[PDB]
Amino acid sequence: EMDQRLGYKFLVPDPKAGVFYRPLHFQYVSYSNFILHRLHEILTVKRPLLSFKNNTERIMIEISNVKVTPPDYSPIIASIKGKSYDALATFTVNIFKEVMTKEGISITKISSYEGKDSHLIKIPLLIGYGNKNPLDTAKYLVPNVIGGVFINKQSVEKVGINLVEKITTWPKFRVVKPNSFTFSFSSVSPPNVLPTRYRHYKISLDISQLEALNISSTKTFITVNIVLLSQYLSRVSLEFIRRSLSYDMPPEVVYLVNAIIDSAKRITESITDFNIDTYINDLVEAEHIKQKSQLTINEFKYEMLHNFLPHMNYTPDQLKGFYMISLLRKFLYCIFHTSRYPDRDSMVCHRILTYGKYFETLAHDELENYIGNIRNDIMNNHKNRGTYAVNIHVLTTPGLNHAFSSLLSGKFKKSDGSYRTHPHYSWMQNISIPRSVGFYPVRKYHPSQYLYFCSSDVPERGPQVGLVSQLSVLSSITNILTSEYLDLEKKICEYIRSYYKDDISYFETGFPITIENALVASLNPNMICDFVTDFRRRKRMGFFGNLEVGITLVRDHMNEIRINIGAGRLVRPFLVVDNGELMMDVCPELESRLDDMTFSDIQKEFPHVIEMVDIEQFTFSNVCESVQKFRMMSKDERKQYDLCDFPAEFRDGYVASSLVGINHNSGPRAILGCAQAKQAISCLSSDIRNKIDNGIHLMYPERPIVISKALETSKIAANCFGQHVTIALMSYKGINQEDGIIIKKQFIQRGGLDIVTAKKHQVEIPLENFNNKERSNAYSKLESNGLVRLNAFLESGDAMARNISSSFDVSEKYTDMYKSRVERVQVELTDKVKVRVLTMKERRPILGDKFTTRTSQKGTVAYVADETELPYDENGITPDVIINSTSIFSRKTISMLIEVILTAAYSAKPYNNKGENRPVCFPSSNETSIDTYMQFAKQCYEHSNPKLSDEELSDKIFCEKILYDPETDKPYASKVFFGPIYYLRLRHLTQDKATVRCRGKKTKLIRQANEGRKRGGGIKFGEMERDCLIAHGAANTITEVLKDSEEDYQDVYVCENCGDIAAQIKGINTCLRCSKLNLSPLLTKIDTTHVSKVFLTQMNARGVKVKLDFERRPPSFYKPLDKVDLKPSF
Amino acid sequence: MIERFISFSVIVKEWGMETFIEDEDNIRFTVYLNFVEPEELNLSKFMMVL
Amino acid sequence: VFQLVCSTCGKDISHERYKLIIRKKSLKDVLVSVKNECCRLKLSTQIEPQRNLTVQPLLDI
Ligand SMILES: [Zn+2]
Ligand SMILES: [Zn+2]
């Protein structure tokens, strides 16, 4: 059970490492890294803008003196007043020309601007843990607040998710067509290179044409044979490339290798006196002439061939050639064994964006646009005027403010889900939303998402099905600074070059070593294993100054060693297995010392017990599933494993940790339970009476006592989402059917599961209308100052503030079928008047209200039974809720039963042997035996009542009782399942869904009932209902349903000649068109809908003439008919 | 099958075939070949597509 | 810590609630005189929520 304790140790706070709240920690840092460090590096630039003469006359733009400051008010003040919560950033800009002189440097100022006193940049600020921001180092924390939100301009709280980057870390394979394949990859500059440079390459291969194995891009590089390019870059023979490619491959690929090499040689020999440099130069010059580039040939060639691979800049060409060769090797292998190469939807080849990265990218883009606009303005001014004057009003609008506002609105490149307004359904949503990960539009459950994302927490319907995932409680996302990145990379390179001097120059039959896809060496195969092992050990001791470095050993036949240090990677802690030995079992002092140590203390003092492993490294390792299964293997079997995993309860999210024993039920029930656990009503906010927002609050909360550790560490349990109620599993007079439930009246009266709904109302009024002096029947609740009165109840026709347009009332109206109490009123006076009101209403359960358990047993109230109409036990206890038992066994929600038993046991003995309150641990993903739970319950009861018979003890343990009929006072046939359980109330209320219409407004164009429940619109009669009514044979019913109301009839005439609606001039019907032509057509009356006339007129607009005839059947007369019998002759 | 593929191939110049009974449970088909120019490129293609 | 009766059976639990919250006696000593399951659960799991002070005035112009 030591592994369980070690897992628990990771979830608790770790003050020594600056972790005060684990569930959101990685987010806080992700923002603290941007606002404090990366912004300064991005802004502080000193770059040329234009150059003249020959590198001796150039304009330079410099930015410096970057300062950022926080607001002067708390976020609660911002919420009440209606302000925004932003930090202010200011900087100074210099534009000056420089001329290179033999005496040194010549500087001639042209312009300078400052923003010392201005809102030069407004950056949204993250509230953070305890209502505390990174800029302000105060010393007061608001309890029960975890933050993770922003407040936008209009005083609206926003929250966002993580997103997956578009650039992958493995090349993408694709079958263009039969025997024609492509292989595309990307290159990006290191973090410390501003601006960042990108390149996107594609390799094309076709069996029919093996001389066109070509690498290409779009208007940034030549189309050249990759083998010849490698020859040019690395200066090696074709036979060398053949031997390198065909070294450790299956014999089926070697034929393709030989074909490719011989095709390259044939190309080589087709040119008289071939020379590689001449070949490349001719290609470059042909590209130069094809384009209209105005640069000199030398400039063009240097630009092309020096930025060939941004991620490997400042390295010799030979390493680039070998990188190309390895890419080709993987291309061929994936051609022949496609199923063994990382798929494009795999998580092995992806990285994730956190809060800080959105802002970082937006700042990058806006800075580039700013400098581009300045350059264009200067060029235009020089073209028209002289002296190179810089226009003002272009170097005062960087454009960051609009970008950040659009980001918080929900727009970010081609994604539209990054941020959203926070719906205040639950207290746990503050955790649930920031820990989600979205993927671009893939809906199948890929094996690589396991153990790092929750298996059961996914959307069940809508367009987002299978595109949003939730981290496990033990997962996280890496952060790293630029300076730390550089130091770590330097240390790794020094280690490689020092300890393996003689065996890193194979390049022909070795394993290439890459750091962030940058080839830096090639290792002797016979030493791969040692290199990894010795490496990982050093990683765990902090030898490199970072414990999250990832090292992967790919060996199928691709034969690569990959090292990752970047940010945006998923990492989990694992137990270490070293040479067929579990380190956790050979560290005796740990068991005695674990109590007084934190996670980082364990890492520092007991290395080699836990290792931080990222997803890619995980996918290629051998991992034992559990400690127990490990201890049952032979030493030879043990020697094959690298890691061992933690118990299963650590593979769930924080939302799924609310449930109990999800592995004893069906999976669909788990999905539904995760979906509804977020809709349960809880203690939403400590500022119930201060914050002016929508919300729902639980009135008399209770803390659950059958829980998992994650629910305890995240504080979800301390903020409550239900109450303990007594339930009986039985049928009640055949009433509680199809998920309906019976509820007790005295339980509702006393306060059972009582909630309060709070709503926000806002209006803007022109000042004259607010001050206008005339009592309409809608202004009954208004005080002498034109504002609604405190603590009054508003009805469905009342107004909140006086608004008279001049002698007419044009104010907005309250439109809920129930009343609400005015809790708070805030007013702002300006050119206009802005009024905000917070109202509250308590809502005891009624028919139609929705409840559920923690095992996805949801039901609505179907009957409110009096206390005297319910069955009771020998102690006189009647159930608060009655639920039909058949559904428990038809849906296979076994855990529910267990829950009840455990809860009952807790009631018998709720304290330790020391007398302290003792919760019962029943995790989701249980792993404990039912017999042990029964033994625990038996011990509890035996402690409670030492003198019990065997039958009584069995009945208590199994929670069985004899119930009596209240009407006759006689027992029922058999015993009933009866006991306490933690019960939840959902947010779907009847009165929020009720709708009715009698008469109202109409849409102007078509003259039909309008839409909108809040606007008194009607219900739509769809054409499927129309089909149903036609299936009954009721022609008149549907005819009258689709027609205009009989009360809206009027006389309309139509011309039988052209189909125009005849006009009425001076009371005379006349068709203008036909009268103009000297015709006298017949005008006839019609009875059709308005929309028909609109449609026909619009069709006439397009040029189509629609003409109607009318039936003139001759008269008919009735004639007597002889009789007919039709009966048989019997 | 083998003979029909070889006979109509456009990358083979001269060919011949024979069959032998290696033992009670194996059969050996032997093919003698000379390819058209270029030689080694066509040899690799043939061994790849056979 | 707010309701004065048990919501399931309607019994009076205010004296035990004072004995627990204000005098801070052991949960065992408190429950010594409570028999019904519902009442024991209520006295063991009920809390008063965490809340800030109210900003005044409630009507501000
Ligand atoms: Zn006409
Ligand atoms: Zn009670």
The SS3 assignment for A406 reads: helix
Q: How many CB pairs lie under 8 A apart between chains A and C?
A: 110
List, comma-separated, the residues after which chain C is broken, a break being a C to N distance over 2.5 A; otherwise answer none.
none
Q: Which two tokens stand for residue C47?
A: 């809390």
d(CA A962, CA A981): 19
Contacts of A76 in chain C (CB under 8 A): 52, 55
Coil vs helix vs strand at C51: coil
Under a CB-based contact definition with an 8 Å cutoff, are residues A136 and A128 in contact? Answer: no
The Cα angle at residue A554 between residues A227 and A331, in degrees rounded to 5: 30
Tokens 């040939």 -> residue: A297
* Helix or strand (DSSP H, E) at A557: none
Q: Give the SS3 label for residue A610.
A: strand
**CA A940 – CA A957 distance, rounded (Å):** 10
Query: Hey, of A750, A906, A945, which one would you mutate to test binding to chain C, going by the most C CBs within 10 A of its CB?
Result: A750
Q: From chain A, which residues contact B within 8 Å (Cβ)? A: 210, 255-256, 258-259, 262-263, 266
CA–CA separation, A707 and A700 (whole Å): 20
DSSP A1051-1107: -EEEETTT--B-EEETTEEE-HHHHHTT----EEEE---HHHHHHHHHHHHTT----
Cβ separation A143–C50 shorter than 8 A: yes
The alpha carbon of A455 is separated from its chain's Cα centroid by a whole number of angstroms, namely 16
CB A827 within 8 A of CB A787: yes
Please report, for residues A909, A947, A1099, C2, C40, the alpha-carbon distance to residue C28 in angstroms, rounded to integers and kept in the order given.
9, 20, 85, 21, 10
In contact, A110 and A59? CB cutoff 8 Å: yes
Helix axes A355-384, A400-409, angle to 10 degrees: 140
Instruction: Give the residue on A whose Cα is nearest the Cα of C8.
Output: A747
Nearest to A917 among C27, C51, C55 (CB): C27
Angle subtended at Cα A967 by Cα A962 and Cα A973, rounded to the nearest 5 degrees: 35
DSSP state string for A1111-1130: --PPP---------------
Are the CB atoms for A495 and A563 separated by under 8 Å? no
Q: What burial class does residue A660 get, using C-beta atoms within 10 Å of its C-beta: 0-12 exposed, 13-18 middle, 19+ buried?
A: buried
Inter-CA distances, A154 with A79, A836, A993, Å? 10, 12, 28
CA of A1085 to the centre of ligand 1 (A): 14
Query: Helices H, strands E: what count in chain B?
Result: 2, 2
Partner A contacted by C59 (CB < 8 A): yes
d(CA A951, ligand 2 centre) in Å: 25
Q: Which tokens hold the place of A534?
A: 């010795």
What are the φ/ψ torsions at residue A339 (nearest 5 degrees)? -70, -15
Distance CA A81, CA A692 (A): 10
Query: Which of helix, strand or coil describes residue A820?
Result: strand
Q: CA-CA distance, A714 to A709, in Å (whole number)?
A: 9
Mutant choice from B37, B44, B49, B50 vs A, greatest count of A C-beta within 10 A: B44
| Greatest distance between any 2 Cα atoms in chain A | 136
Cβ(A657)–Cβ(C20) below 8 Å? no
Distance A1042 CA to ligand 1 centre (A): 28
DSSP E strands in A953-1067: the ranges are 960-961, 976-985, 1052-1055, 1063-1065
Task: Return the beta strands (E) in A902-970 as ranges.
Answer: 920-921, 960-961
- The minimum CA-CA distance between C18 and chain A, rounded to whole Å, is 17
β-bridge mates for residue A574, sequence order = A611
Residue ranges in A459-583 assigned as alpha helix (H):
482-499, 528-540
Nearest to C45 among A703, A875, A915 (CB): A703
Residue A788 CB coordination number (10 Å): 24
For chain B, give the residues followed by a break (C–N over 2.5 Å): none
CA distance C21 to chain A (A): 14
Starting from the CA of residue C7, give the closest ligand. Answer: 2
Number of structural domains, chain C?
A: 1
CB interface of B with A, residues 1-40, below 8 Å: 38, 40
Q: State the Cα angle at A136 between A133 and A142, rounded to 5°.
A: 60
Here the tokens at position A402 are 């609009």
Bridge-based pairing state of the strands A832-843 and A755-766: antiparallel
CB atoms within 10 A of CB A310: 16
Looking at all shown ligands, the one closest to residue C10's CA atom is: 2
DSSP H or E stretch at residue A872: none
Cβ pair B47:A256 closer than 8 A: no
Give chain C's end-to-end CA distance (angstroms, integer).
36
Give C 3-42 residues with CB within 8 A of chain A: 3, 5, 7-10, 26-28, 31, 36-38, 40-42
In three-state form (DSSP H/G/I as H, E/B as E, the rest C), the secondary structure along A433-468 is CCCEEECCCCCCCCHHHCCCECCCCCCCCCCCCCCE
Residues of chain C in contact with residue A826, where contact means CB-CB under 8 angstroms, are 60
Q: How far is CA A1059 from the centre of its chain?
A: 57
The answer to whether A903 and A982 have CB atoms below 8 angstroms apart is yes
Place of tokens 């298996």: A455
> A80 and C28 in contact by Cβ < 8 A?
no
Instruction: Give the residue on A whose Cα is nearest the Cα of C25.
Output: A915
In a 10 Å sphere around its CB, with 0-12 CB exposed, 13-18 middle and 19+ buried, how is residue A208 labelled? exposed
**Of A354, A420, A365, nearest to A163 (Cα)?**
A354
Q: Which residue of C has its CA nearest to A787?
A: C59
Q: Coil, helix or strand for A1012? A: coil
Q: What is the spatial distance between Cα C30 and Cα A433, in angstroms, rounded to a whole number?
A: 41
Backbone angles phi, psi at A76, to 5 degrees: -70, -40
Measured over the CA atoms of residue A595, residue A601, residue A606 and residue A608, the dihedral's sign is positive
Cβ neighbours of residue A812 closer than 8 Å, sequence gap 6 or more: A763, A799, A800, A803
CA A120 to chain centre: 31
Measured CA to CA, the distance from residue A1102 to residue A1096 in angstroms comes to 10
Domain enclosing residue C28, as ranges? 1-61
Residue of chain B nearest A260, judged by CA positions: B41
**Structure tokens of A828?**
């702002």
Specify the DSSP class assigned to residue A756.
E
The helix/strand/coil state of A797 is coil
Which helix (H) or strand (E) segment holds residue A201: the answer is: strand A198-206
Please state whether the peptide bond connecting residue B38 to the residue before it is cis, i.e. omega within 30 degrees of 0: yes
> A880: how many CB neighbours lie within 10 A of its CB?
26
Tell me the C-alpha distance between A376 and A353, whole Å: 33
> Between chains, do A262 and B48 touch, taking CB under 8 Å as contact?
no
Backbone angles phi, psi at A1052, to 5 degrees: -130, 135
Nearest ligand, CA A1072: 1
Give the number of whichever ligand sits closest to the CA of residue C13: 2
Q: What is the enclosing helix (H) or strand (E) of A99?
A: strand A86-101
Taking the C-alpha atoms of residue A46 and residue A63, their distance in angstroms, rounded to an integer, is 7
Cβ <8 Å between A259 and B38: no
CA distance B25 to chain A (A): 25
Paired sense of beta strands A859-865 and A741-744, if any: parallel
Answer left, alpha or beta for residue A186, where phi above 0 means left and psi between -120 and 50 means alpha: beta
Residue A326: exposure state from Cβ atoms within 10 A (0-12, 13-18, ≥19): buried
User: Which of B41, B47, B48 minimises the CB distance to A263?
Assistant: B41
Q: Where are the alpha helices (DSSP H) in A337-390?
A: 355-384
- C-alpha distances (whole Å) from C39 to each of A192, C16, C44 are 65, 10, 8
CB contact under 8 A, A705 and C38: no
Report the 10 Å Cβ neighbour count for A332. Answer: 21
DSSP A767: H
Q: Of A525, A612, A611, A610, which Cα lies nearest the Cα of A561?
A: A525
Give the pair of three-digit tokens for residue A625: 């599933």
Structure method: cryo-EM
Query: According to DSSP H, which parts of A541-586 are helical?
Result: none
In 3D space, the residue among A881, A843, A890 whose CA is nearest the CA of residue A859 turns out to be A881
Can you read off the two tokens belonging to residue A654?
């924080």
Q: Do B47 and A262 touch (CB under 8 A)?
A: no
